[PDB]
Subunit: 106 residues, 3 copies
């Protein structure tokens, strides 16, 4: 999928979590966020159309997604153990990664 | 172990999974693939004998293994929850990482 | 927290594990090591005060923590499955990461 729909997938599933009743709703959204993250990681973003895929910026751009994926996973472990509010807490924490990549590349 | 035996460990365990009966067979092979991945990640590969360990290429070379290890882990979670065919599906997906590193460094 | 207290958190929890009775003691320390690792990863270390945050060295410095976090996680999985001595074995293995970052940046 395109960078922009993956960002809507990231954004949407975030709302799904912060309002979720239960663990399965959380696990499902995190699963979907992981997929989107990983697929957005393949894209070249507007701001960086002038850079080769092995530029330092494209490298750093792809690293922002590694960080998000690691976090999602840590949230997933909490979801997997039925800890729905701390899972929700994690999901909320992801924001500072979202915003760190956005400050520099969006 | 040497880069080349680790690649045979990666390759072999891949066949073990795609033909596995059960979860324990999958978990075991993934465990072994993780080990080999991590050990191959220390090696300097023929194509890159002329580069320092902190060259951008050696950096990128080691990143190909981070991606594989993350994927293996995601497959492991599926194996750990008794999902043997989707675990098998994951293991198959790893191929595009194997081949992405190979296109550029093999 | 500061780089140096996070390193004491890393160091302390390591002793907690290698002497632990049970899985919950291990899971708790690993959880805390993950937190500290991730927080130390934001710091700029003395040796690198003269480098921009996107220098290759600051990049490599932050990667040393990715490796530690991945390992901690692998130890956590063992802890989570009640495997207290192999969890302890993992925790001990972390040392070569600790020391690899230290050789070059401490
Ligand atoms: C869960 C955390 C994240 C959320 C909730 C999120 C959400 C969004 C949203 C809603 C947009 C605008 C989409 C649109 O309507 O066009 C966007 C754009 C963007 N994001 Fe994210 N994002 C996240 C993580 C990241 C990360 C980690 C990176 C960098 C590694 C990143 C890089 C970008 C870029 C480059 C755009 C603009 C692309 C363009 O100009 O077409 N995002 N994000
Ligand atoms: C599970 C995925 C992978 C599989 C199944 C796999 C399998 C193999 C096999 C069968 C070989 C030839 C071994 C021989 O008979 O000598 C090989 C070579 C090689 N692979 Fe992989 N590999 C994988 C992942 C990777 C990754 C991620 C990288 C890079 C990060 C990589 C880098 C290399 C290199 C450099 C060689 C050639 C080394 C030499 O010339 O001695 N491989 N791989
Ligand atoms: C679990 C593994 C680790 C342990 C047990 C550990 C432990 C320690 C300890 C005890 C200190 C001295 C603290 C003090 O009394 O001031 C220290 C310093 C330091 N470590 Fe670690 N560490 C680990 C991992 C890492 C990693 C992965 C990195 C690099 C990525 C790193 C980078 C540094 C640096 C730069 C200092 C010195 C900071 C300064 O000069 O203020 N450490 N570590
Ligand atoms: Ni796509
Ligand atoms: Ni990197
Ligand atoms: Ni996990
Ligand atoms: Ni070896
Ligand atoms: Ni701090």
């Amino acid at each position: 999928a395109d960078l922009e729909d993956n960002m809507e997938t990231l954004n949407d599933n975030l709302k799904v979590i912060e309002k979720a009743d239960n663990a399965a709703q959380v696990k499902d959204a995190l699963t979907k966020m992981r997929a989107a993250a990983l697929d957005a990681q393949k894209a070249t973003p507007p701001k960086l159309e002038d850079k080769s895929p092995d530029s330092p910026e494209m490298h750093d751009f792809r690293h922002g997604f590694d960080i998000l994926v690691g976090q999602i996973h840590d949230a997933l472990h909490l979801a997997n153990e039925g800890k729905v509010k701390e899972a929700q807490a994690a999901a909320e924490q992801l924001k500072t990664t979202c915003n760190a990549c956005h400050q520099k590349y969006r």
